[PDB]
Paper text:
The UbiD superfamily is composed of a wide variety of (de)carboxylases acting on aromatic, hetero-aromatic, and unsaturated aliphatic acids. Prenylated FMN consists of an FMN molecule modified by the addition of a fourth non-aromatic ring joined via N5–C1′ and C6–C3′ linkages between the flavin and prenyl moieties. Following binding of prFMNreduced and formation of holo-UbiD, the cofactor undergoes oxidation to form the catalytically relevant oxidized prFMN species. In the UbiD enzyme family, Arg173, Glu277, and Glu282 (A. niger Fdc1 numbering) form a conserved ionic network.
Residues Arg173 and Glu277 also occupy the same position as wildtype in the high-resolution crystal structures for E282Q (1.13 Å/1.28 Å). One structure shows the presence of a minor species corresponding to a prFMN hydroxylated at C1′, whereas another structure, obtained from a separate protein preparation, shows unmodified prFMN. Residue Gln282 is observed in a conformation within hydrogen-bonding distance (2.9 Å) of His284 (position II). Additional density in the active site, in the position usually occupied by the carboxyl group of Glu282, has been interpreted as a molecule of thiocyanate (a component of the crystallization solution), mimicking the CO2 product. The E282Q variant of Fdc1 is inactive, which could be due to the inability to catalyze (de)carboxylation but could also result from defects in cofactor maturation. We reveal that crystal structures of E282Q do contain additional density on the C1′ of prFMN corresponding to partial formation of a hydroxyl adduct. This strongly suggests that prFMNiminium is formed. Furthermore, the reduced prFMN is not stable in the presence of oxygen, rapidly forming a purple-colored radical species. Both the E282Q variant in solution and crystals of E282Q remain colorless under aerobic conditions, suggestive of prFMNiminium formation. Hence, Glu282 is not required for maturation of prFMN.
Numbering used by the authors:
A (entry chain A), B (entry chain A): 4 to 499, 502 to 505
């Protein structure tokens, strides 16, 4: 099976790419696996495959860390991401985001039901598993539980059967047969939970699939629109219908090659302690436990020699930056274009801990609008911050055509030099805030409202007659024939490879 | 003579450090020298010494580019700066800034007058030079003139003789015997010019010395207090009295080993076209010529085989970032401590294009003040933004004890995650602004007022009971014995030098 359609094939692809280290000696799931993974993420090293987990029993489980993290070289920086999508490993960020947006103007390709697949190779009923006995990792030293769920896909369906959502949301082991996790607005798992709660008749049929098709975990991490079934979007994106098999104890459908599948229910009434968790902005507040949603597990099915993917998230750079930030940015690009705003490109700079999105403006288009910074800031911020795709993002930075939004150094340059503090910004206090950001949920103001800003790093003439500066840099402040002469004589004179 | 006391010795020190490239083939001062220098600055390469300048006549002149720029390795990153001050080349930023502040609580060491020195080896009178015939560089393609003055020291004295100031301010050739340049408030050259203008009797006696003692050019770049003679400050800092020789045509005194000396007058009445210039924020606005101050040159004296230092300034990283930003930060640290604020460290992040200063707070001290973010922001901003040492700085970022302000990644992390936009900031509109920043002088609001902000990246409990988080990073989220185990097994497992 292809790497983008089968997680086991994806692991082999990373091996073959010399982007994997197989660790075959015993590693403790209590902190050690995650500490190695954290080190990998902080240094852009090879992904670790832990083949010998202390406490693995009857095939459950190996761990792959850092599945969507960065590579060290510039040339294949995003190569792990590319391998989720059948793209060349030297793909740029723009190419990866365009692949994830491509299905937005295509008919869905609904999934294909097959009678079995590798995820049915083994099963454990209600009397045969205990989630507290599996080698679930403790990811950070102060975490409030063992976070089994950092890179699986929650599967829930609307009561009327018309929408089946696939998403990533964290969950931890509560007891032998229950998890607790985050289910918060405006996320689709929460929106669907609310529909079940309003109907009031039963708990939500649920499945959690780990080691799913890499293209499916990417869509799981992307804010595609309300009511759109991720399976059909991924089918469109990849050009192929995804093969799904029915759960044994409910009527949901899971990827046939899922490594591990939990089947059960998401309660419409019960809660349980959840968190704290070391999270995407780089923090853990020890002892900050709150009540989260509660899931009951009725059945586990799994592949022979099952592998659980794990994100050891926190400070730069891991899946919470490369996937959450970038895929929100992509959806924000599209949303702005659909609202007739002249946005060409969007990216969440890693240096902002993916709390900012830089929006590259087609300033020829802007000039024809004959508008002003105040008006334009307001319009952009009303579109993005009143939509779900803006949820996680607290600062939008508008930049002109000379800035590459995929390069955080240039975004930082433009923000620092072109946006006058106060005057060139509009604050938004009556929008949904992201409470996970420390300055929200642990800050001075309301955890769930406000704290957002549009910062205009367009210069005045970009609205009127055109750019009226040149950069004071080697590229822009010297003529071409001089530049080339300097480059050609560089090593001759005494001064000091693209792949490496 | 020691490197920190003699520019010629400094050049030799860079050679010996393998931090120089001597270019002995012909290089054009029209753009080529500066383009090589710009490339060096953008890549942290070795400093270029142009020994064969097209148009050099009778010893005037060789050029040394990038005299205070960065080195490529992390271990001796600031080594060129260290060599201005007799510090080891592996000196940290904190050590360099502490050396520049050290004379602030020492008695001055006034200079020593000697009868001659190397700067008198050659001279040209009123009938023998023409500034338009010297190999003055064109630094950027759209510059409004040939900027002879990017790394010399202007020397002016108060009318009453009590204060002699040394400072860097840009100047360009106007004609055969005049320069034009920036002389703007609140800078000391402007403050002294105003005193002469108020007296109204004559033009200001002036000298411009190039290739001065490296320790003197550093103090020239630092906002030491009003009325304090830089020579005596440098004498205190270095522990030695600086040797000065009298000018031939006025009664000012220049460093005895200056490479090149211009003697004349700064007009109290005349102006002339000046700029545009590719400047420290990375921009040039072509055609933006304004009237600047006018200097008359009566005499040139110079060393045999004179070398003119040159800053090819613009985008990161050059002397305008490493010296202007850092030395302002140092003075701001001191100013805050003198006003009883609990600041331990200050640095202008390069990523902000040196428009921000991050202030590290001793949060034990802060807690004992029993204050609030609003009050504390206000107090810090009133102290810094109403002083000259805050002139260039438009954003102050307050951070707690866990942030290393010398590491821009950590400053960016804390600003992005701990400061709520709007709520955690105070805008200052009734302070002096820095008009050179594009969003000031070419922006939407008054070029000379406002546009400043204090951004509080202290968390709420840092004012009350103490830090209540741990970072979700390898250092803070794993116990010590685990960390060391991981590091010790790193290469054994399969994963991947301080000097490199
Ligand atoms: C890639 C990725 C995404 C997320 C998460 C993680 C990773 C690795 C964790 C490591 C598990 C950390 C956790 O904070 N986490 C997470 C989460 N969204 C939540 O509601 N709850 C969460 O606990 N997202 C983001 C969501 O996946 C996206 O916002 C997506 O858009 C949701 O899908 P949908 O509602 O649009 O269908
Ligand atoms: C290191 C350095 C400092 C400065 C400059 C440059 C370099 C390399 C130029 C490349 C020439 C660019 C120019 O923008 N420039 C410059 C300038 N200050 C100005 O009033 N005018 C200027 O044109 N400073 C800053 C000043 O040197 C300091 O602010 C110092 O504090 C002044 O001394 P004082 O008034 O405190 O005595
Ligand atoms: K999704
Ligand atoms: K602006
Ligand atoms: K000075
Ligand atoms: K704050
Ligand atoms: Mn969805
Ligand atoms: Mn001074």
């Amino acid at each position: 099976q292809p790497a983008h359609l089968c997680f086991r094939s994806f692991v082999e692809a990373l091996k073959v790419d010399n982007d994997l280290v197989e660790i075959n000696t015993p590693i403790d799931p209590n902190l050690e696996a995650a500490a190695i993974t954290r080190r990998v993420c902080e240094t852009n090293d090879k992904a670790p495959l832990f083949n010998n987990l202390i406490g693995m029993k009857n095939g459950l489980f190996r761990i792959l860390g850092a599945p969507g993290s960065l590579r060290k070289s510039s040339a294949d920086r995003y190569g792990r991401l590319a391998r989720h999508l059948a793209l060349p490993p030297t793909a740029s960020m723009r190419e990866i985001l365009d692949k994830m947006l491509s299905a937005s103007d295509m008919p869905p390709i609904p999934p294909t039901i097959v009678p079995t697949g590798p995820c049915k190779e083994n099963s454990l009923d209600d009397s045969e598993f205990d989630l507290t006995e599996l080698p679930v990792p403790l990811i950070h030293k102060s975490d409030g539980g063992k976070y089994i769920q950092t890179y699986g896909m929650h599967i829930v369906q609307s009561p009327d059967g018309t929408w089946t959502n696939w998403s990533i949301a964290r969950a931890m082991v509560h007891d032998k047969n229950h998890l607790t996790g985050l289910v918060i607005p405006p996320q689709h798992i929460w929106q669907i939970h609310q529909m079940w709660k309003k109907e009031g008749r039963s708990d939500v049929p649920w499945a959690l699939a780990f080691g799913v098709p890499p293209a499916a975990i990417m869509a799981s991490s992307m804010p595609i629109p309300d009511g759109v079934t991720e399976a059909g979007y991924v089918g469109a994106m990849t050009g192929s219908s995804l093969e799904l098999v029915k759960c044994d104890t409910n009527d949901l459908y899971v990827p046939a090659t899922s490594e591990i599948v939990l089947e059960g229910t998401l309660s419409i009434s019960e809660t349980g302690p959840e968190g704290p968790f070391g999270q995407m902005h780089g923090y853990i507040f020890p002892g900050d436990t709150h009540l989260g949603a509660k899931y009951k597990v009725n059945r586990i099915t799994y592949r022979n020699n099952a592998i659980m993917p794990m994100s050891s998230c926190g400070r730069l750079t891991d899946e919470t930056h490369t996937m959450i930030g970038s895929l929100a940015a992509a959806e924000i690009r599209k949303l702005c274009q659909q609202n007739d705003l002249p946005i060409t490109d969007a990216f969440a700079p890693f240096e902002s801990q993916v709390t900012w999105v830089a929006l590259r403006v087609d300033t020829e288009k802007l000039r024809a609008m004959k508008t002003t910074s105040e008006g334009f800031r307001k319009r952009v911020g009303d579109v993005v911050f009143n939509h779900k795709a803006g949820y996680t993002i607290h600062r939008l930075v508008l930049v002109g055509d000379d800035i590459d939004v995929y390069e955080g150094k240039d975004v930082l340059w433009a923000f620092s030099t072109r946006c006058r503090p106060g005057m060139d910004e509009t604050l938004f206090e009556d929008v949904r805030g992201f409470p996970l950001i420390p300055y929200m949920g642990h800050g001075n103001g309301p955890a769930h409202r406000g704290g957002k800003v549009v910062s205009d790093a367009l210069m005045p003439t970009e609205y009127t007659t055109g750019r009226n500066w040149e950069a004071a840099d080697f590229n822009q402040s010297y003529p071409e024939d001089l530049k080339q002469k300097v480059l050609d004589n560089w090593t001759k004179m005494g001064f000091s490879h693209h792949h490496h």
